[PDB]
Design a protein around this ligand. Structure first.
Ligand SMILES: *[C@@H]1O[C@H](CO)[C@@H](O[C@@H]2O[C@H](CO)[C@@H](O[C@@H]3O[C@H](CO[C@H]4O[C@H](CO)[C@@H](O)[C@H](O)[C@@H]4O)[C@@H](O)[C@H](O[C@H]4O[C@H](CO)[C@@H](O)[C@H](O)[C@@H]4O)[C@@H]3O)[C@H](O)[C@H]2NC(C)=O)[C@H](O)[C@H]1NC(C)=O
Ligand SMILES: *[C@@H]1O[C@H](CO)[C@@H](O[C@@H]2O[C@H](CO)[C@@H](O[C@@H]3O[C@H](CO)[C@@H](O)[C@H](O)[C@@H]3O)[C@H](O)[C@H]2NC(C)=O)[C@H](O)[C@H]1NC(C)=O
Ligand SMILES: *[C@@H]1O[C@H](CO)[C@@H](O[C@@H]2O[C@H](CO)[C@@H](O[C@@H]3O[C@H](CO)[C@@H](O)[C@H](O)[C@@H]3O)[C@H](O)[C@H]2NC(C)=O)[C@H](O)[C@H]1NC(C)=O
Ligand SMILES: *[C@@H]1O[C@H](CO)[C@@H](O[C@@H]2O[C@H](CO)[C@@H](O)[C@H](O)[C@H]2NC(C)=O)[C@H](O)[C@H]1NC(C)=O
Ligand SMILES: *[C@@H]1O[C@H](CO)[C@@H](O[C@@H]2O[C@H](CO)[C@@H](O)[C@H](O)[C@H]2NC(C)=O)[C@H](O)[C@H]1NC(C)=O
Ligand SMILES: *[C@@H]1O[C@H](CO)[C@@H](O[C@@H]2O[C@H](CO)[C@@H](O)[C@H](O)[C@H]2NC(C)=O)[C@H](O)[C@H]1NC(C)=O
Ligand SMILES: CC(=O)N[C@@H]1[C@@H](O)[C@H](O)[C@@H](CO)O[C@H]1O
Ligand SMILES: *[C@@H]1O[C@H](CO)[C@@H](O)[C@H](O)[C@H]1NC(C)=O
Ligand SMILES: *[C@@H]1O[C@H](CO)[C@@H](O)[C@H](O)[C@H]1NC(C)=O
Lengths: 435, 96, 97, 48, 49, 48
């Protein structure tokens, strides 16, 4: 016979990180195997065609990564100019849009996200003098290039990716989600936010009564997001993990050449410097087989990782489509609570979603009854249940508390008062009072 | 069109070994008539650069793409290099 | 004898069943409000009424035939055990793996 | 023996990926069907 | 010009099974390969990582 | 379809390689060498 109805609400903002892509690499057999050796090159040619498959697989992986990035980020072919003002009815859109003070083409949060996670070796512009042709301490990157291992840059640059996020965020503040299904439709932000509250079962009037509180809570949550990101260093873990995995795989592949397998020496120059070719062929064969086995293992692992990244990118693209360009009623799909809107943020080899939700709180104690009997007839509520104070009765919502008098337009009449259990005596307001 | 990845094409002669290659590569090793322009990934040789932006046809890297033109009036049969276009621009304004 | 070992799972069988017991008990006391926040007490008869409301059916039909619905639910729950006992192919994926 | 070990490890990795996909689907179904009501067709059985 | 409207309802309960996890295993090379042999252990060490 | 066809064709045409043996064909190896010497030649082909 009791019921709990919340009387207050709070606005909470949560974050979520999904990897979108990984690095692209290429392998040359004639350089990794039989480095600067004509006889070994001829022997490898005689061995057979065991290297075209590796190149085809690597090219397919690179194309798949590019396609994943394009599908995740490039979805709407319309660039919307950032508005000059960044205050829409008390809501502060300052930490999500780029600052025109400096042409960095990135927002305040995106700079922190980029600086939080590091990269192995950016640029891909290393020349002689930057490798052992000049002077180094034998860096890993130059060692990789000495054995035919190269890393290709992504098709889309960092600046171009941030442009998509800037267009997506700006479009939301000007049209909501109408531009995702077609052309843009201008609408005030205060009225746009009102119908977001309407989709979660809450009446429209509550937003206008407490607009200032909602705006203050939203701004406070947005500001606290930066502090939470600064104070912690474990949220951005998946990108670091995948970068470290790729780097470790490349380093292990490079350092695997030290093993001589069943031969007499890992070096190939000395073998040809002391043995005849009829005896050197046996020594070379086992080295060739071992190096080919290592390359095959690396390619298989890369293919498996590419499949996993493809699945993750598909999930991220689906979430972006169903959570940013619209409102989703799926439970725990866009955070905790009732989803209102989402903001996309670019991350290195990933994407970050900012989910704004509605969370009720401050419950109160009340009693309820199933139905109401007026005169031999039972009345059932249309939107809500019956509450009671001090021998009284009212009809209110569930996500918010707002009592109202029981009238004939709030309850439909059906059935008698005998079959229903728990029905009680009560009167119903007569519309024909002033008559 | 040959793209020498991971090198500055100011230093092609000290990298391509001009003195130990055929004259065909000597053609692709000299900066004459704007045939060498530095990109973000490398420096492309054998193609002409163009302004504006078009849809990407042959991916290259770092926002650069390539395409082949068949021109009869200008007698142009070379490769073009350009930056891909993000998309068309809109002019939707805010109002309360 | 050849270095092949199998490691036990972190969570025991008893601990796993505790989660199921908590989940089932929470549904009978709050429905699905506890998933989005704190628990909200509600009678089960009224909780089941709005489940019928979400599928486009009016609320009055549940109170008119509550006994029939309860009997059908109990009969289906009881028949689930008989169906599980009489067959041996439903639980196939776990055996396969 | 090393080749046999490599084959076993590769098969185990593939099976682990498949089990990961199945577990993700199961977790999504648990979240969207037990802690709420879903209107998706044929997602929580047959009917409404 | 015709339409069919149901007049009765029934409650049905169905079951569904989804795997969640599998067994966890570990492998030792020095025991699976070169079982109790110092020379074979040295050869395996020489083979590589 | 093209990927499956290419994989099958590559698997079929991979037999031309002799690896570290003296000939890809197996008939001639048994036609000129004793079994004690032919076993070594056959082993590498089998492994490949
Ligand atoms: C549960 O919550 C409900 C919320 O509505 C409360 O119901 C109201 O309770 C208050 C307080 O007792 C009642 O207010 C009183 O009403 C009378 C005046 O009513 C005039 O207006 C109504 C229309 O609104 C006309 O029908 C009526 O003819 C009158 O013209 C007076 O008895 C009272 O006046 C006293 O207070 C005022 C203001 O302080 C003073 O100026 C007066 O001198 C005098 O002291 C008072 O205003 C109200 O009528 C109740 N509403 C209903 C619908 O019944 C429940 O009381 C609450 N229960 C508990 C246990 O808290
Ligand atoms: C329940 O919701 C109500 C609004 O429906 C909240 O009441 C008001 O909440 C705001 C939040 O900013 C309070 O403002 C603050 O008040 C003081 C002023 O000295 C100070 O702390 C801040 O500068 C700020 O302005 C406001 O006072 C408050 N009103 C009342 C009457 O309390 C209420 O806070 C919500 N309940 C909870 C528990 O959050
Ligand atoms: C159509 O729905 C109606 C209810 O809206 C069903 O009518 C009633 O169904 C119940 C089911 O338990 C019947 O109860 C059974 O009745 C007899 C009593 O001797 C016996 O079989 C059982 O012990 C049980 O109590 C009830 O009689 C029945 N009422 C009538 C008037 O038939 C109806 O069954 C539904 N139709 C179908 C085809 O299921
Ligand atoms: C709801 O109101 C009805 C209509 O007045 C009540 O039914 C009558 O109640 C009076 C006393 O108030 C009895 O003297 C009559 O015999 C009742 N008539 C019948 C049963 O046909 C009904 O009891 C009320 N429900 C309650 C109080 O729970
Ligand atoms: C490639 O060579 C050119 C020509 O020397 C470099 O252009 C300038 O290089 C200096 C010295 O690094 C920079 O300070 C200038 O900003 C560059 N540009 C201009 C317009 O002067 C170019 O930087 C070289 N690239 C690399 C990667 O070393
Ligand atoms: C909607 O925006 C316009 C400007 O685009 C606002 O017009 C201003 O109204 C104030 C009222 O005090 C005037 O002082 C200003 O001169 C007006 N122009 C500007 C450029 O500020 C208008 O008030 C806004 N509407 C609402 C409801 O806030
Ligand atoms: C007019 C307005 O609201 N401006 C705010 C400013 O007060 C705040 O300091 C900044 C974030 O630091 O965002 C913007
Ligand atoms: C609500 O009031 C009832 C009155 O019997 C009491 O038993 C119950 O504990 C109260 N609930 C809460 C949540 O305070
Ligand atoms: C192409 O762009 C260059 C670089 O800005 C400029 O100097 C040149 O005039 C442009 N050519 C046109 C617009 O035809």
């Amino acid at each position: 016979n009791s019921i709990a109805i919340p009387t207050n609400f709070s606005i909470s903002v949560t974050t979520e990180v999904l990897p979108v892509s990984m690095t692209k690499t290429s392998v040359d057999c004639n350089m990794y195997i039989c480095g600067d050796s004509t006889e070994c090159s001829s022997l490898l040619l005689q061995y057979g065609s065991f290297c075209q498959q590796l190149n085809r697989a690597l090219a397919g992986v690179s194309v798949e990564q590019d396609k994943n990035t394009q599908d995740v980020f490039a979805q709407v072919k319309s660039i919307y100019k950032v508005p000059a003002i960044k205050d829409f009815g008390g809501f502060n859109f300052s930490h999500i849009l780029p600052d025109p003070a400096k042409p960095s083409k990135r927002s305040f949060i995106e700079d922190l996200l980029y600086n939080k996670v590091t990269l192995a070796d950016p640029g891909f512009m290393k020349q002689y003098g930057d490798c052992l042709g000049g002077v180094n301490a034998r860096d890993l990157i130059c060692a990789q290039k000495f054995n035919g291992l190269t890393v290709l840059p992504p098709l889309l640059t960092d600046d171009m990716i941030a442009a998509y996020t800037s267009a997506l965020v700006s479009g939301t503040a000007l049209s909501g989600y109408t531009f995702g299904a077609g052309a843009a439709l201008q609408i005030p932000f205060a009225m746009q936010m009102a119908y977001r509250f309407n989709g979660i079962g809450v009446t429209q009037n509550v937003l206008y009564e407490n607009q200032k509180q909602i705006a203050n809570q939203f701004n406070k949550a947005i500001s606290q997001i930066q502090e939470s990101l600064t104070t912690t260093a474990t949220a951005l873990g998946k990108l670091q993990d995948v970068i470290n995995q790729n780097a470790i795989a490349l380093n292990t592949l490079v350092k695997q050449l030290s093993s001589n397998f069943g031969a007499i020496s890992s070096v190939l120059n000395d073998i040809l410097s002391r043995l005849d070719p009829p005896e050197a062929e046996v020594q070379i064969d086992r080295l060739i087989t071992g190096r080919l086995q290592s390359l095959q293992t690396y390619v298989t692992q890369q293919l498996i990782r590419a499949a996993e990244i493809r699945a993750s990118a598909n999930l991220a693209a689906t979430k972006m489509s169903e959570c940013v360009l619209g409102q989703s009623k799926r439970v725990d799909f866009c955070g905790k609570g009732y989803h209102l809107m989402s903001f996309p943020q670019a991350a290195p080899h990933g994407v970050v979603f900012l989910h704004v939700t509605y969370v009720p709180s401050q419950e109160q104690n009340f009693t309820t009854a199933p139905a109401i009997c007026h005169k031999g007839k039972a009345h059932f509520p249309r939107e809500g249940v019956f509450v009671t104070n001090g021998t009284h009765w009212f009809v209110t919502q569930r996500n918010f508390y707002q009592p109202e008098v029981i009238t004939t337009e709030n309850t439909f009449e059906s059935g008698n008062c005998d079959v229903v259990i728990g029905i009680v005596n009560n009167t119903v307001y007569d519309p024909l009072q002033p008559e | 069109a040959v793209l020498y990845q991971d090198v500055n094409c100011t230093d092609v002669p000290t990298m391509l070994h001009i003195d130990q290659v055929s004259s065909d590569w000597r053609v692709y090793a000299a900066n004459t008539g704007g045939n060498m322009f530095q990109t973000q990934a490398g420096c492309l040789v054998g193609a002409t650069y163009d302004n504006t932006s078009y849809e990407c046809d042959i991916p290259v890297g770092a926002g650069v793409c390539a395409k082949f033109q068949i021109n009869t009036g200008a007698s142009q049969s070379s490769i073009l290099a350009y930056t891909m276009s993000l998309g068309e621009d809109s002019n939707v304004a805010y109002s309360n």
